[PDB]
């Protein structure tokens, strides 16, 4: 998921660096339940 870009014209002005910055370690339990009121 890329970072929040600035004004795209300012991004073009800044260049490739402001483009560059954007882009089983720990177990976990999980769930989901889908219900209709």
């Amino acid at each position: 998921e890329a970072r929040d870009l600035g004004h795209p014209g300012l991004l073009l002005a800044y260049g490739e660096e402001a483009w560059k910055d954007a882009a089983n370690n720990q177990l976990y339990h999980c769930r989901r339940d889908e219900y209709l009121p």
Binding site: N24, Q26, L27, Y28, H29, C30, R31, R32, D33, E34, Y35, L36, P37
Partner: peptide, 30 residues
């Protein structure tokens, strides 16, 4: 409609290989 969920960070006693000690996942047959 409406969805809800929860999580829990459980902790094995020793630093074990956390790739064979995985809790199984059960799904509803329906």
């Amino acid at each position: 409609p409406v969805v809800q969920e929860c999580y829990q960070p459980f902790h094995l006693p020793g630093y074990r290989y956390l790739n064979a000690w995985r809790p199984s996942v059960f799904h509803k047959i329906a």
